Amino acid sequence: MTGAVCPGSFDPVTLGHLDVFERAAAQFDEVIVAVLINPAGMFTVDERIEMIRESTADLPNLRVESGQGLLVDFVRERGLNAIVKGLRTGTDFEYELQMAQMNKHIAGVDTFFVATAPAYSFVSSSLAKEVATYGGDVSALLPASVHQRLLGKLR
Amino acid sequence: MTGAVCPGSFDPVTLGHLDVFERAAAQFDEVIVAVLINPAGMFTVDERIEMIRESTADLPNLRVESGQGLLVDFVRERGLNAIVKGLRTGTDFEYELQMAQMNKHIAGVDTFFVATAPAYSFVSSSLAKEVATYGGDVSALLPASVHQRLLGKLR
Amino acid sequence: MTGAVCPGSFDPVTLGHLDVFERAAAQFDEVIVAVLINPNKAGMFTVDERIEMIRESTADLPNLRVESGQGLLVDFVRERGLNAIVKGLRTGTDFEYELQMAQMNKHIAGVDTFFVATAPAYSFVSSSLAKEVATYGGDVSALLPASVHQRLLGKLR
Amino acid sequence: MTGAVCPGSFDPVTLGHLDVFERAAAQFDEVIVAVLINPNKAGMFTVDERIEMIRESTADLPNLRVESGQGLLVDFVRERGLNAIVKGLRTGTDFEYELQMAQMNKHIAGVDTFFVATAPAYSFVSSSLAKEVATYGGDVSALLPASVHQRLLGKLR
Amino acid sequence: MTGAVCPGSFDPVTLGHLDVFERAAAQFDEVIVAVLINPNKAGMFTVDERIEMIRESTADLPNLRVESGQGLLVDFVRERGLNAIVKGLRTGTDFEYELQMAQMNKHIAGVDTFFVATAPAYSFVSSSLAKEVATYGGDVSALLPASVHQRLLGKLR
Amino acid sequence: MTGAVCPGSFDPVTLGHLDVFERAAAQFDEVIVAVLINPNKAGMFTVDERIEMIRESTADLPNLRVESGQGLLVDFVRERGLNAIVKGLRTGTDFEYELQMAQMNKHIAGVDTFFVATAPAYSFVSSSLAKEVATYGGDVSALLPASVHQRLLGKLR
Ligand SMILES: O=C(O)c1cnn(-c2ccccc2)c1C(F)(F)F
Ligand SMILES: O=C(O)c1cnn(-c2ccccc2)c1C(F)(F)F
Ligand SMILES: O=C(O)c1cnn(-c2ccccc2)c1C(F)(F)F
Ligand SMILES: O=C(O)c1cnn(-c2ccccc2)c1C(F)(F)F
Ligand SMILES: O=C(O)c1cnn(-c2ccccc2)c1C(F)(F)F
Ligand SMILES: O=C(O)c1cnn(-c2ccccc2)c1C(F)(F)F
Questions:
Q1: D78 closest CA partner among F60, C139, F30, C131
Q2: How far apart are CA F79 and CA D18, in angstroms?
Q3: At residue A72, what are phi and psi to the nearest 5 degrees?
Q4: How far is Cα A103 from Cα A99, in angstroms, rounded to an integer?
Q5: Where is this site: Transition state stabilizer (chains C, D, E, F)?
Q6: Using CA atoms, how far apart are residues B86 and A100, in angstroms rounded to an integer?
Q7: Nearest-CA neighbor of D2 among D31, D28, D25, D20?
Q8: How many Å lie between the centroid of ligand 6 and the Cα of residue F127?
Q9: ∠F113-F119-F122 over CA atoms, to 5°?
């Protein structure tokens, strides 16, 4: 009964996030995607959850839930003690290392990092929204469903 | 039936390695420590395997084996496709990211990185051997068994 | 035939920027300095002030011109028939961030980015830090062209 | 008479900060901890509360004293007859941004900066992260001086 | 007439290198690929084999030519009437060591260096890692030009 | 009373090292430059040559002395009644590596390490790169003290 939580704001989820989800789902019996409401973004929590569920239909051991407060409480209240997160740069690692060691200290929750797929090294939710806002084509970087939903928000 | 391989030269295994072993063993049903013979070190492969087995007696789902050649062949010939490795710095991440993406490309094997425990951020097999060689006390950095075995090699 | 765009907010231009301009102008037939304005946040200097400070300190570069713009940099570049951006970089940290944007710009528009290492003497000057130091009275005259220094002190007073 | 200034916001002081203070006080004849007041961003503790928390945790350091400061740090340093800053560093990116500021401070005023590596146990503690964790009920008692923790629980109630 | 030199050992050339060559040839009137011979470390392919592999993979680049070089790179560059180097970068630590060399080359000879970010697909390929993987039977065909791969299988038999 | 050790192989000393020496000598009552010799690998300069090159370029620093040693740096430090090492750092990459050794040195012997940011003008000089450039005939006279340059060219010829 292994399991991990994949956290983030996912505003919106990108193909980089989805690649991490599929990789976590392939190595752990249970995966929970934690959509963290940070109470100002583009999509509502429900819409963000919707887009992830649509894009993770092929992953039977994955579910999607919203959460508030400490991530470690979200993890431990579901019987787990591992977090899985994607990393692009050494700079990412240093910032995330601080939070990973804090989370282990306060609650015994482990963090496992996975290297980004090379093709998505440059995609982030914020850069994809910025480029799309000014008319650039980001369709190769986002799940097909998400892309249409993003156009709607702009138009 | 989840599982991961923890690779390295482990010449000798340190408390930093052992911390990664225990963390991998807590999140995967099966863990194999792969002692990679790089065919010049201090300990023989058999001695390195011995010291790890002695220090991992409390971990029932972990075993220790030697290997040669491509790590991904070692992993896949045992039915697994995940590697777990410890990281200390962003610099570590960048070097290891290259190998992780290569390994995923050539064989579909995933790599999960874990942040070092803060207390062991500065310990490496090479620095521990260097300091011990010149008379410094490294007993707080190595498993009790390993420490005695290292003194023997020097004296 | 060859050409490159050197973008930034240049609020204000520094000696580190001018070094990049000179090195680009030496290696490309034409260089356009692109003063990118955020229509939603005013900086310290207006667009015309930024352009005049750059023009005054690049008068000896005959193949360089200065133009403002907004929106996607790649559109500014391609509308001028060009395909290359030249940017200065100070650290490995600079490189990871700028690498994200350079790969995105290549992905969406085919525009290449060439990075150049800062001159050592300017490794530590940035528009933001020079403004912050000047605000509290520190002497930054050796980090900014003559075209900028006293205009900066005037803005602060 | 050697000496150095240890600057920061210390809102609140952490055991990481205290480790730096102790190491500085062991190597310089005099150390001044400079509690940097920011007229804009007012955090969780008042300046006087921050000073009293540092004084409580540094009671065994007779050559260290604590004062509030405002404006340009190199003026604070040089107005006290000193010309060195001591700061703790956790990571390589810590070094990058701090390196720019140190080179700037050396250029504008001749003040030098000495960096010390964090004790391993505190590499992950910061004032901001400790406050955030504590706000949602996490136990950060092992990361802060004994007295800070009680004062921090009171501010949250 | 603008131009740049693309240096390396290219033992063997990878698709990452070729991407850099193509981007340099698109932006400079002339590009010279400099295959750096090292009298000490002789790798897997002879200099002439390396040159022929690069020429095969760059057949569609008419303004790029390939030559061997020895000794100080800035002499090679300046003996050909050029004063720019173009190199690909993968990571922030790539930038660090390369930044030192670029500043040194600018200081000692006035030669500038322009860095281009790797195409994302090749961020993990290097000559050394491709050789090592291939030596133990791994399939690196998608990371090398078609012709290199055949030649590489022959050297391993 | 206060004191610090500045260690290195200094083969040979550079202007970047001398800058660190001067900054340490300004902040500590005494400074010892520790020339650490590897008895198993000769460098370019003998131990006596390294010491004389340092002494000749530090003659204006009355509180600095130069001594060689081998083995554990912390033993050199503590045998002189001191507890502090001062080292220059150029990058975040420098910092991660040196942080490992500094934390180990603190762990095994209680010795503190203070790092100082390189002067910008010397960010790119290292003993190894200056030797490599000089070997192939590049001009490094502005990166080394007078005490070194011609002795270096003599070694190479
Ligand atoms: O923040 C984002 O916006 C965002 C969007 N895609 N990816 C992501 C990209 C590559 C690999 C894994 C994730 C991110 C993240 F990693 F930075 F987290
Ligand atoms: O190489 C070594 O020698 C060595 C020895 N301990 N640890 C290690 C240290 C901290 C956390 C995890 C591992 C290493 C390693 F990570 F660098 F791999
Ligand atoms: O951001 C700024 O305001 C700024 C101002 N000077 N320089 C700069 C410094 C050195 C070399 C090239 C440019 C920057 C930059 F590095 F960030 F690009
Ligand atoms: O900013 C903070 O809030 C903070 C709080 N503890 N430490 C710190 C941690 C370890 C060693 C030295 C200091 C910091 C700092 F280094 F980031 F400065
Ligand atoms: O050294 C090598 O062997 C090698 C082989 N491919 N690439 C490379 C990879 C991606 C983009 C550009 C070049 C390198 C280099 F960048 F590390 F230079
Ligand atoms: O390794 C060397 O040989 C060397 C030679 N000069 N400098 C140096 C450069 C700038 C500031 C301080 C020192 C080094 C060092 F950075 F690596 F320490």
A1: C139
A2: 28
A3: -65, -30
A4: 6
A5: 17
A6: 13
A7: D28
A8: 7
A9: 110
Distance CA E103, CA F120 (A): 11
Instruction: For strands C112-117 and E112-117, give the pairing.
Output: antiparallel
As a whole number of angstroms, the distance between CA A100 and CA A103 comes to: 5
CB contact (8 A) between residue E91 and residue A90:
yes
CA–chain centroid gap for E137, Å, is: 25
- Distance, in Å, from the CA atom of E70 to the CA atom of E72, rounded to the nearest integer, reads 7
At B148, list the tokens.
Answer: 């005695």
CA distances from F68 to B57, F73, F126 (A): 47, 11, 20
Give, for E130, the enclosing helix (H) or strand (E): helix E127-135
Q: Within a 13 Å sphere around the CA of E22, how many CA atoms are in the beta-carbon half? A: 15
Residues in chain B: 155
Compute the distance between CA of residue F109 and CA of residue F124 in angstroms, rounded to an integer.
32
**Contact C96/B97 with Cβ under 8 angstroms?**
no
Enter the tokens of residue F149. 């340059």
C124: nearest CA in chain F?
Answer: F120
* CA atoms of C154 and A138, how far apart (whole Å): 44
Tokens 């502005």 map to which residue?
A: F142
Sorted by where each begins, the domain ranges of chain B are: 1-155
Q: Is B148 exposed, middle or buried (0-12, 13-18, 19+ CB in 10 A)?
A: exposed
> Exposure string (b/e) for A38-63, b if CB count within 10 Å is 16 or more?
eeebbbebebbbbbbeebbeebeebe
Question: Which of F95, F124, F129, F141 should one mutate to test binding to chain E, selecting the residue with the greatest count of E CBs within 10 A?
Answer: F124
**In chain B, what is the straight-line distance between the N-terminal and C-terminal CA atoms, in Å?**
45
The structure was resolved to a resolution in Å of 1.7
Question: What is the DSSP code (8-state) at residue C112?
Answer: E
Residues of B engaging E, defined by a Cβ cutoff of 8 Å: 69-70, 72-73, 90-91, 94-95, 97-99, 101-102, 105-107
How many CB atoms sit inside 10 A of residue C67's CB? 12
Q: Which residue from E95, B79, A104, E126 is spatially nearest to C116, judged by alpha carbons?
A: E95
CATH for the E1-157 domain, from 3.40.190.10, 3.30.70.1140, 3.40.50.620, 3.20.20.140: 3.40.50.620
Contacts of residue B33, Cβ cutoff 8 Å, sequence gap at least 6: B5, B6, B7, B8, B10, B21, B52, B56, B62, B63, B64, B65
Is the C-beta atom of E122 inside 6 A of ligand 5? yes
CA distance D133 to D151: 15
β-partners of residue D114 are: D86, F116
Q: For domain A1-155, which architecture applies?
A: 3-Layer(aba) Sandwich (3.40)
- Pairing of the two strands B62-67 and F84-89: unpaired
**DSSP letters spanning D19-49:** HHHHHHHHHSSEEEEEEE--SS---SS-HHH
Residue type, A123: V
Which among B59, B55, B76 is positioned nearest to B4, based on CA atoms?
Answer: B76
Two tokens, residue D53:
């928390």
Is F141 among the residues known to form the active site? no
Determine the residue type at D118: T
Lookup: tokens for C17? 């920027």
Using CA atoms, how far apart are residues C118 and C14, in angstroms rounded to an integer?
A: 12
- Distance CA(B97)–CA(B53), nearest Å, equals 29
Q: Tell me the two tokens of residue C128.
A: 């933001």
Q: Which of E19, E90, E93 to mutate to test the pocket of ligand 5 (most atoms within 8 A of CB)?
A: E90
